[PDB]
Amino acid sequence: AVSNEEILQDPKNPQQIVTNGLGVQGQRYSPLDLLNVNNVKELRPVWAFSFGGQKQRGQQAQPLIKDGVMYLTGSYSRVFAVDARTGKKLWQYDARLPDDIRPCCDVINRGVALYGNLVFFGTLDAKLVALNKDTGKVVWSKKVADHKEGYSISAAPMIVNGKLITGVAGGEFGVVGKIQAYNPENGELLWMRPTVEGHMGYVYKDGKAIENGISGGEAGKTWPGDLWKTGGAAPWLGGYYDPETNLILFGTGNPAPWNSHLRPGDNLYSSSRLALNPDDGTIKWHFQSTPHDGWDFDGVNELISFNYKDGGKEVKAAATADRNGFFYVLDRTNGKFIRGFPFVDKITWATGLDKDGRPIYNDASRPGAPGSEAKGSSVFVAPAFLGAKNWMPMAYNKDTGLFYVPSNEWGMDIWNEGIAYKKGAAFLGAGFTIKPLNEDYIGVLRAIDPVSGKEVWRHKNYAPLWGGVLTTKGNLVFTGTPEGFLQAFNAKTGDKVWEFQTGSGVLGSPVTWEMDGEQYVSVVSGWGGAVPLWGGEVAKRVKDFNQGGMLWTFKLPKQLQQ
Ligand X SMILES: O=C(O)c1cc(C(=O)O)c2c(n1)C(=O)C(=O)c1cc(C(=O)O)[nH]c1-2
Instruction: Give CA torsion, residues 315, 511, 525, 344, to 10 deg.
Output: 20
State in angstroms the smallest separation of the CB of 39 from Pr ion. Answer: 42
110 carries a ligand binding annotation: yes
Q: Could you please report the per-residue DSSP string of 9-36?
A: HTTS-TT-B-STTSSTT---EE---SS-
Judged by CB, which is closer to ligand X: 466, or 552? Answer: 466
Binding map of Pr ion across residues 155-174, x = CB under 5 A, - = no contact = ----------------x---
State in angstroms the smallest separation of the CB of 141 from ligand X. Answer: 20
Site for Pr ion in 112-151 (CB under 5 A): none
Report the candidate in 411, 495, 490, 397 with the shortest Cα–Cα distance to residue 448.
397
* Side-chain half-sphere exposure of 217, counting CA atoms within 13 A: 6
Pairing assessment for the beta strands 359-361 and 350-353 based on DSSP bridges: antiparallel
**Partners of 274 in the β-ladder:** 250, 286
In the set 296, 345, 363, 544, the catalytic residue is 296
364 carries a ligand binding annotation: no
298 carries a ligand binding annotation: yes
State in angstroms the smallest separation of the CB of 201 from ligand X. Answer: 19
533/549 Cα distance (integer angstroms): 19
Which whole-number Å values give the CA distances from 531 to 390, 435, 538, 539, in the listed order? 11, 12, 8, 6
166/153 Cα distance (integer angstroms): 8
- For binding to ligand X (CB under 6 A), which residues are involved? 104-106, 108, 154, 169-172, 234, 236, 253-254, 296, 298, 386, 390-391, 529-530
User: Which of 166, 254, 259, 290 is close enough to bind Pr ion by CB under 5 A?
Assistant: 254
Judged by CB, which is closer to ligand X: 35, or 268? Answer: 268
Query: Is 270 near Pr ion (CB under 5 A)?
Result: no
285 carries a ligand binding annotation: no
At residue 63, φ and ψ (nearest 5 deg) are -65, 150
- H or E element in which residue 508 lies: none
205/427 Cα distance (integer angstroms): 35
Per DSSP, helices labelled H in 227-370 are none
State in angstroms the smallest separation of the CB of 547 from ligand X. Answer: 14
State in angstroms the smallest separation of the CB of 392 from Pr ion. Answer: 15
In 390-508, the DSSP E strands lie at 395-396, 403-408, 410-416, 430-436, 443-449, 454-461, 469-472, 476-480, 485-490, 496-501
170 carries a ligand binding annotation: yes
Judged by CB, which is closer to ligand X: 350, or 539? Answer: 539
User: Which of 6, 298, 409, 417 is close enough to bind Pr ion by CB under 5 A?
Assistant: 298
Q: Select from Pr ion, ligand X, none the partner in contact with residue 518, using the beta carbon and a kind-dependent cut-off of 5 to 8 Å.
A: none
The question of whether 296 is a catalytic residue gets the answer: yes
Site for Pr ion in 299-338 (CB under 5 A): none
369 carries a ligand binding annotation: no
342/328 Cα distance (integer angstroms): 9
254 carries a ligand binding annotation: yes
Judged by CB, which is closer to Pr ion: 180, or 270? Answer: 270
Exposed e or buried b per residue across 262-288, where buried means at least 16 C-beta atoms within 10 angstroms of its C-beta: bbebbbbbbbbbbbbebeebbbebbbb
345 carries a ligand binding annotation: no
Start-to-end CA distance of the chain, whole Å, equals 34
Q: Select from Pr ion, ligand X, none the partner in contact with residue 238, using the beta carbon and a kind-dependent cut-off of 5 to 8 Å.
A: none
Judged by CB, which is closer to ligand X: 35, or 105? Answer: 105
Query: Is 111 near Pr ion (CB under 5 A)?
Result: no
Judged by CB, which is closer to Pr ion: 154, or 522? Answer: 154
State in angstroms the smallest separation of the CB of 221 from ligand X. Answer: 22
DSSP assigned state of 8: H
Task: Tell me the catalytic residues.
Answer: 296
Residues in the annotated binding site for pyrroloquinoline quinone: 60, 110, 154, 170-171, 236, 323, 390, 466, 530
Per CB under 5 A, residues contacting Pr ion are 171, 253-254, 298
Residues in the annotated binding site: 60, 110, 154, 170-172, 236, 254, 296, 298, 323, 390, 466, 530
Residues in the annotated binding site for Pr(3+): 172, 254, 296, 298
